Amino acid sequence: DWKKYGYNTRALHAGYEPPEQATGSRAVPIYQTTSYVFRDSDHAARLFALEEPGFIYTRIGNPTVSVLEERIAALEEGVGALAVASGQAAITYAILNIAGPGDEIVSGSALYGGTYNLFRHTLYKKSGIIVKFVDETDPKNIEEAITEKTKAVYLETIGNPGLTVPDFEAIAEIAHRHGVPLIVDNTVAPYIFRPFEHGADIVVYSATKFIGGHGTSIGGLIVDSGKFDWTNGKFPELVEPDPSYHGVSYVETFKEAAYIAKCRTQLLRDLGSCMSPFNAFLFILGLETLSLRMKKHCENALKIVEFLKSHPAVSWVNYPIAEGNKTRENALKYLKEGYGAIVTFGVKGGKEAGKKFIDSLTLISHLANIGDARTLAIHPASTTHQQLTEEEQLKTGVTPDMIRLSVGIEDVEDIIADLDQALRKSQE
Amino acid sequence: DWKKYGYNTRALHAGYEPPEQATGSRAVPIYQTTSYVFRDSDHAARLFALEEPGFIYTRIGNPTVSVLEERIAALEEGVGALAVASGQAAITYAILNIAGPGDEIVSGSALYGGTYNLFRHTLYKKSGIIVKFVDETDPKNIEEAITEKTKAVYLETIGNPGLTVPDFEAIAEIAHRHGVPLIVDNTVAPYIFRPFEHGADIVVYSATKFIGGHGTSIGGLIVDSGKFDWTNGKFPELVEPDPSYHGVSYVETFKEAAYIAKCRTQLLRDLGSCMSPFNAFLFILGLETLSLRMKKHCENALKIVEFLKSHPAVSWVNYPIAEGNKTRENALKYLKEGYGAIVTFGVKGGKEAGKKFIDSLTLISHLANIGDARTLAIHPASTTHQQLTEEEQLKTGVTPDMIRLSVGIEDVEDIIADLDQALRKSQE
Amino acid sequence: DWKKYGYNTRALHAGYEPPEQATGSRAVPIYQTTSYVFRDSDHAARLFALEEPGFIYTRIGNPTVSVLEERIAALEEGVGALAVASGQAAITYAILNIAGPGDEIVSGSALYGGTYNLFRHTLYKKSGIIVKFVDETDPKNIEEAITEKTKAVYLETIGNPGLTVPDFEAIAEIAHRHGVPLIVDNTVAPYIFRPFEHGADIVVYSATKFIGGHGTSIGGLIVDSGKFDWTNGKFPELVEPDPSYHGVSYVETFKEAAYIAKCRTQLLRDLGSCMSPFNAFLFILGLETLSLRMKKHCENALKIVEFLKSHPAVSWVNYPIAEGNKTRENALKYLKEGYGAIVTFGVKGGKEAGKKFIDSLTLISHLANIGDARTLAIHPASTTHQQLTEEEQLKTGVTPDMIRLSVGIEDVEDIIADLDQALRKSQE
Amino acid sequence: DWKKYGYNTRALHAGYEPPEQATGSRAVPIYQTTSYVFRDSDHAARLFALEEPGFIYTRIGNPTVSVLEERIAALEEGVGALAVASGQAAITYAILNIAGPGDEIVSGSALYGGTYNLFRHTLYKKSGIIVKFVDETDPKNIEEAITEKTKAVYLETIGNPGLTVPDFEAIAEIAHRHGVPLIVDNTVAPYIFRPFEHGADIVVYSATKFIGGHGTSIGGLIVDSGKFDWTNGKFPELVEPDPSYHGVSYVETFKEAAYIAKCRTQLLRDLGSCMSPFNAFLFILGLETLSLRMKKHCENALKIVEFLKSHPAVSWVNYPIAEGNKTRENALKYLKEGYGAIVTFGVKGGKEAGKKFIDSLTLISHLANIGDARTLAIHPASTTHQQLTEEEQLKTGVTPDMIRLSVGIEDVEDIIADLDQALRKSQE
Numbered sequence A, B, C, D: 001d002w003k004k005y006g007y008n009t010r011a012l013h014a015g016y017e018p019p020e021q022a023t024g025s026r027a028v029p030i031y032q033t034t035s036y037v038f039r040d041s042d043h044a045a046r047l048f049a050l051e052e053p054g055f056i057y058t059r060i061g062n063p064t065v066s067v068l069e070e071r072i073a074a075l076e077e078g079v080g081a082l083a084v085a086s087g088q089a090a091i092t093y094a095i096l097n098i099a100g101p102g103d104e105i106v107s108g109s110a111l112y113g114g115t116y117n118l119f120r121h122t123l124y125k126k127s128g129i130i131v132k133f134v135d136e137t138d139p140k141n142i143e144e145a146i147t148e149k150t151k152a153v154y155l156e157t158i159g160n161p162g163l164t165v166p167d168f169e170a171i172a173e174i175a176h177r178h179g180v181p182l183i184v185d186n187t188v189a190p191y192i193f194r195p196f197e198h199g200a201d202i203v204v205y206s207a208t209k210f211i212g213g214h215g216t217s218i219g220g221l222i223v224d225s226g227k228f229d230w231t232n233g234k235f236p237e238l239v240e241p242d243p244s245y246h247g248v249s250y251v252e253t254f255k256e257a258a259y260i261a262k263c264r265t266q267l268l269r270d271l272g273s274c275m276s277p278f279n280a281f282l283f284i285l286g287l288e289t290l291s292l293r294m295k296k297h298c299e300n301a302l303k304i305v306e307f308l309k310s311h312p313a314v315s316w317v318n319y320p321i322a323e324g325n326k327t328r329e330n331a332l333k334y335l336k337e338g339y340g341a342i343v344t345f346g347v348k349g350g351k352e353a354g355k356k357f358i359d360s361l362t363l364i365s366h367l368a369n370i371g372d373a374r375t376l377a378i379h380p381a382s383t384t385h386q387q388l389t390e391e392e393q394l395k396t397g398v399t400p401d402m403i404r405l406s407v408g409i410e411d412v413e414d415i416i417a418d419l420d421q422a423l424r425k426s427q428e
């Protein structure tokens, strides 16, 4: 449960030791409730005033959700975590907790298409936040984009689907020198990469993906390392008395957990992007097998890459350590326990033959998701990144002929068998 | 399912006739999935490009949630509905869909404390929206607050816990004359009041409360009447080509459902406050008995009021048709099928004896919720409205001595008995 | 929770007051767990030895399931209840708990088709129990069938679908004088009839039906009145030391609850017909509206009967108080709060026109169930009672032309409207 | 999905390819319904008469449960499977399908205590079946116990907790030569052992254990290999016309699936030990990681065995391949992919020091279960096998000082640490 225990021990125990005291239930109960009876009038007031911890209302906190949050925090070795309705909500909250109208964010370009559209369109239109996209393959572009309005630097661990890996430590040094935190979306690399150990201050997850692992539940997570000093004047909301809580100071009351505390008391309570206790239950079950699944995902993915490189129908193949990958060196440096499950390739004939490939699949699933146990395929340019212009797609690494694979944990020969027949048919 | 069928028939059938065609399941299945397999590449492209309706990803839409959405729409006689993670998210989305940084909102003052804090602080700090609180008990106050930056007028059906009822028709005329829609929070009066029949253009619900009815699940709903013309120049996002969808015009493509459509394609997709399919399943079950429960709720409330008015320990009692209610006339006009389940009262001895009353309850539950099947009690000044200053509390109708009851559907004799013993103990 | 509180108060509170002590969750949590951590080695031993109550293993007992059991017991005013996988399982356990190879059961003939087949075939072939079916419309037939091997007398409250009602008190007098308990399947009449107030010793329910009320979940319940003396020598398994529990005597240890206690420690533990915690959660929600739904069911049923009596397409109509019903007097005597939701009728043209009626329904659902909120229809001779010979069907009240309705809680005008169009098509 | 695909591919796809056709949901929906709308009167009649397959009623079959059933059958390469409420119910149904009053079963003695109690007491008292327990470590004991009343031979793969492994092939030869099937309880060895490849005809599982893998859900499975000829005269119920289905012959109508078909149409339909769709949903998720979890379970168990053998506090250690194990040879021959997760040992000081060991655990959970992801410990003599006499306990391999471990998938260092500290305290 603590930092002394192994990763798999934590994934099975952290946040729920001892078990619930009334009945001793070994599994995390599904507290499908909105409300909780208070001990007395004074207890209720202390709870609402942030003077005592406890459960008040499922929008703000819930015992099932708390187990997931505390377990994620222990696995990331952070000071606390917060679960929200979706990955999008986690990214939105992570930004909104330290940024507002007029503020800026410096973001990498290897982004999931929904993150780009949020940064490029929705956050500007609705929150007045101005995101400056840069080529994070060169840390200098991060440095040169930072202004006095920048509030954070944002990166994806392995670009979806660019498959580029930024130089985390070099970029973190730059962000901290300018007094801003580094935010890392570790959606595609839980367990196999520890962002906090390489300069990241905040980590967000799409729990929907590898953390859940079974494609059953939408969810998002925010994890606070507690390592960042919020008192440099650039984040007064975390320092100054909060009028909505009659003067509470997050840095004073919550100390290293100031950031993740305000995500709950401010953003979750008012904006209301809360996770269902049922979804949290399913995410907890997913965590219990994460390390086993990631190892298989990455073992199979490497074999898929080798198969695609030698197939006559395949124009090109990309993977974080591919010979042609611009950031191959970073991947070798930072990814010591697998290079991810996402594999991209192009089929001879361009976009048109790719569609024949997708339409010929008999086992691989054509759908919008990643990090399911099943192997998945999709054409990002018309789907996950459809919202972006042709040039914006190129900036994220999406080409008109790109096929995106999420290599699952089937027996790899059956994955390869389905790929081969579909590729041969694609050349007809 | 259609407008020809009764309320209860619709509450049992609308949105799910015929049953799911693969197996014929009479109950609404729980589609606890993230993703859906596409027929082919062209099908996937048409879905993502908004050219054909269908299911893409549970963050954006889901078959279980769709049944809830369509059934609520049928019960409200709207053109469409959208389910979100919570009542707060529904309110946030309802505003953000037609308002942004610099824009203004005219809002009533009888607000749930979380709505007030959202309007007063969070929407300002995070979205730059300026909410103008007014005394909605006199329609003139609405008119005089509207400027050329106003995007909507916002009201609660029966103030939580002010118990004031605004003049819906009069305010709707004012909002429409200035070319802005009326948004009505009908959380506390589903079935028993139809805002669309009295000038409202958008309705939001905390489904958490009476719609669910059993205190199991957090949820929110947005209902679009389809009656409002968005083309007067004040809502360009609904008319002009959307850059994020390569030129789609919401009024052109979706006609009467433009508003609720952008709620989904923009706000739900990017901000990510999605509802769980499991929660929607439970809300659907609640709707099937809603009319029966509301009738019982309101019948018990009338008797509880009579009992409290005659008790020696009770300083005052409020209810929408109480003689002393400032908006008694509006309540008599608009509330023809029950005056709600919420009852407020003061105990001799002020705040101190009130706290003893709460602490002496043995059957009524001391918790934060309304619209549960069980009878509930709380002290709003220190709980639901703690975030507000003393003067803001008075503006919402919360007094330091106020006890709020949510009268449940127990046998009324047992409710009265628990009140009586606790009221007598409060005088010791 | 106690006998002092009203039925609806109990339906909202009994078995879960106070709420679960660890978190105070107002809703009954879903303890989807198999196992429970024991305090110590000695605690575990005392639990397994039946020396102390507690939770051991979900096959045997579960906190969510316990609330349902304790709540059902409070509504029936019994000493205890047991939840099982299905109504069939409840009936199977009720019999096997006091009968074995060579023993006899005296049963009425107005039986659900699955109960008849269990009694006539499966319990004989698999347990050696010999069921003696009699015409329970005359209590004398019960008396004359009892032998020294008889272990119980079994009845349905309102025959499904014979719609006959036995003389409960007269039959109870007969059974008790012969030293055997009366078992009553109250599936179709919860709340509206209390068998314990009219001589019944044990009650079973298909929780699937009206108790759930929404057609989501299969479940069964066994309720023990505690009124029957098991020491007359005809039930030594309930008196003698149990070798499997090292000498425990159920009457000595469990006193009035000896019968329901062995159902759990013996039949549930070894035969394993356990209910899921999730299902119990849903039945608990159903109980909270049971009285409201049953009243509506019965109000609508009376109106449907009158409509069918006047329709030109209808050959005949039956209801417990119909002029031609053999047990109209029993129905008038015992059913003081509604006569049930089941209605049977025949259409001119016999069996062939009946099929045309069923196939012409557009709102009433053609499926196998009763006591759903929706109105249902089926042809028992080919479905629920298909397993029975022609003569056995007649003994249960099923005729070749019989259509069975389960009148739901839609607005009655929509039910009648759908009936009318479908009956007219049946005559074409 | 078919026999050509690997085990893990089948574990991810079999039974749900293609996805449900109405919405294409990639995850298996939770069909939490009781009933299904029929196409027409003739369709309903054909279903109930067993003339066409389809869904009728969740007690008998359900689309979510069917996916679990078909996936288990595909993993076992059997002709079909049936899901029931519990492992106990699976064992009960497997026996009752081919046995009745007066019949005999030849069973091994290395049994779970609940199976022993079912065989020794409940099946005798309630079904008149006479189980003859033998020492299955010598196949001759099976041969010499068979009479003309024998209907099956029953074995556990790895005795719980005897840890003995029978000679499956030798016993299967004896059973088949005498014209009776071999039934194998493979609860503790899914994936790692394939009973059908070694003479077994029927396999039963407690899905509760490793198949679920997370201690969330009670469930049982019956798997039919389809290999056994039921027409040798010893099983007339599977050949002769069935009176309850108006002459249907299971061998004639269902061919290789005769046995598993009658389990459903007779035993499940009438005795009613049905599984919840929600539980089945969770079992499907568990299967997706089964091969991963089983490998880790067995790797850790081998290391735990090594650690216990060298600890000064440990009197003895048992494991399927332990030097002192009577069936070490059988274990080496049949178990080529892991020797299970269950490990037993005794502590110096006998029963008294063992209790101190159990009471000193801080990470390993003291509860009644096996095959959870967490490491578990219990004292079988006072818990799982308490119902057995001292002599019966020894015959199953349970000694007064035996501690049973279910080694989970934590990091093995943390498991050893908790064992070590607890063993040291046991010597004080």
Ligand SMILES: C=C/C(=N\Cc1c(COP(=O)(O)O)cnc(C)c1O)C(=O)O
Pocket (backbone or CB within 6 Å): A057, A059, A272, B086, B087, B088, B089, B112, B114, B115, B156, B160, B185, B187, B188, B205, B206, B207, B208, B218, B219, B220, B368, B369, B370, B384
């Ligand atoms: C404890 C919550 C209470 N009320 C919540 C509420 C909300 C928020 O909805 P949720 O986010 O909680 O789902 C929106 N609108 C109205 C009118 C409300 O009363 C209450 O009992 O005072």
Ligand SMILES: C=C/C(=N\Cc1c(COP(=O)(O)O)cnc(C)c1O)C(=O)O
Pocket (backbone or CB within 6 Å): C086, C087, C088, C089, C112, C114, C115, C156, C160, C185, C187, C188, C206, C207, C208, C218, C219, C220, C368, C369, C370, C384, D057, D059, D272
């Ligand atoms: C679909 C089955 C029907 N009825 C079931 C039933 C049962 C069995 O209970 P379950 O196992 O199905 O839960 C027991 N007793 C009575 C009175 C019943 O009507 C029906 O629609 O006619």
Ligand SMILES: C=C/C(=N\Cc1c(COP(=O)(O)O)cnc(C)c1O)C(=O)O
Pocket (backbone or CB within 6 Å): C057, C059, C272, D086, D087, D088, D089, D112, D114, D115, D156, D160, D185, D187, D188, D205, D206, D207, D208, D218, D219, D220, D368, D369, D370, D384
């Ligand atoms: C407490 C239960 C335990 N075991 C149960 C079990 C069963 C019964 O299955 P269920 O009814 O519990 O699902 C059948 N077969 C075997 C081999 C078993 O080990 C245990 O902890 O040893």
Ligand SMILES: Cc1ncc(COP(=O)(O)O)c(C=O)c1O
Pocket (backbone or CB within 6 Å): A086, A087, A088, A089, A112, A114, A115, A156, A160, A185, A187, A188, A206, A207, A208, A218, A219, A220, A370, B059, B272
């Ligand atoms: C890398 C990454 N970040 C964020 C998201 C958004 O996740 P969610 O679907 O849970 O909102 C996704 C979804 O594709 C993703 O892949």
Ligand SMILES: [Mg+2]
Pocket (backbone or CB within 6 Å): A146, A147, A148, A178
């Ligand atoms: Mg700078």
Ligand code: NA
Pocket (backbone or CB within 6 Å): C051
């Ligand atoms: Na003792």
